[PDB]
Design a protein around this ligand. Structure first.
Ligand SMILES: COC(=O)c1ccc(SC)c(S(N)(=O)=O)c1
Ligand SMILES: COC(=O)c1ccc(SC)c(S(N)(=O)=O)c1
Ligand SMILES: [Zn+2]
Length: 258
């Protein structure tokens, strides 16, 4: 009876195995754009993905991960609210059963169809496993997806999903360039938070871009054909793999713009 997003093991149940679910810096959160403070001390984000080395795509049972070689400083996030250098380890998405839901963060209560998370770990801690034990261990760059015109740079991901339909399937996925998933503007909101799945560790500096990317209906429909179940099990479409907004508590959301 493991956690998930089904009818009986969803987000409202997670606190029973992971009491930090009710902690002081849980994510995601609603971003109330009127209350977020413009912070002129925040720096432009530095996204350096020119040398990124994608390796493999994995259906992890809850979403799919596009994994990167993070055994040296290839693809790094720096600047913005961050001190030091954060190495890209993987990205994944959260998405809905319908276009009107799917995102984890919300903006003035608006849900987007999906949300991309580029996960990076702080090099000062040497490895991801050590970094998630630290209050500044991870930096997750979040990008909203809306449904409209296709995102050409997403199509390579869409096209391999039929090869990783069920939990635990993987496929080679080299030479994928994550720059093609970025919006034009790197204006962002930032706040201290958590992983949004168990173990829900409070180790994330969240950076959420204001500008969504547009994907096509057909692209997001192909996300919705993935399965939470393993091969040869009854089908559980992989949809609504998002955690709802959690209490902001004693936190300030800062804007880089405004
Ligand atoms: C400390 O947390 C993790 O490393 C972690 C948490 C959740 C997941 S899947 C929901 C994974 S994954 N994508 O299976 O490597 C990794
Ligand atoms: C469905 O969410 C996931 O599968 C998922 C897997 C890994 C991570 S971080 C290693 C996350 S998150 N949203 O970054 O905490 C989420
Ligand atoms: Zn995520």
């Amino acid at each position: 009876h493991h956690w998930g997003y089904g009818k009986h093991n969803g987000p409202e149940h997670w606190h029973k195995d992971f009491p930090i679910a009710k902690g002081e810096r849980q994510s995601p959160v609603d971003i109330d754009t009127h209350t977020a403070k413009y912070d002129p001390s925040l720096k432009p984000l530095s996204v350096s993905y020119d040398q990124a080395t994608s390796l493999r795509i994995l259906n992890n049972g809850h979403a799919f991960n596009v994994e990167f070689d993070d055994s040296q400083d290839k693809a790094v996030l720096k600047g913005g609210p961050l001190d030091g250098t954060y190495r890209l380890i993987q990205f994944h998405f959260h998405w809905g059963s319908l276009d009107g839901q799917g995102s984890e963060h919300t903006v003035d209560k608006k849900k987007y169809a999906a949300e991309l998370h580029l996960v990076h770990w702080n090099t000062k801690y040497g490895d991801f496993g050590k970094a998630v034990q630290q209050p500044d261990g991870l930096a997750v760059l979040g990008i909203f997806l809306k449904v409209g015109s296709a995102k050409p740079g997403l199509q390579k991901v869409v096209d391999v999903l039929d090869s990783i339909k069920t939990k635990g399937k993987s496929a080679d996925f080299t030479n994928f360039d994550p720059r093609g998933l970025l919006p034009e503007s790197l204006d962002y909101w930032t706040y201290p938070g958590s992983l949004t799945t168990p173990p829900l560790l409070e180790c994330v500096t969240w950076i959420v871009l204001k500008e969504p990317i547009s994907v096509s209906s057909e692209q997001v429909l192909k996300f919705r054909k993935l399965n939470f179940n393993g091969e040869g099990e009854p089908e559980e479409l992989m949809v609504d793999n998002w955690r709802p907004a959690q209490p902001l508590k004693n936190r300030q959301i800062k804007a880089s713009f405004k």
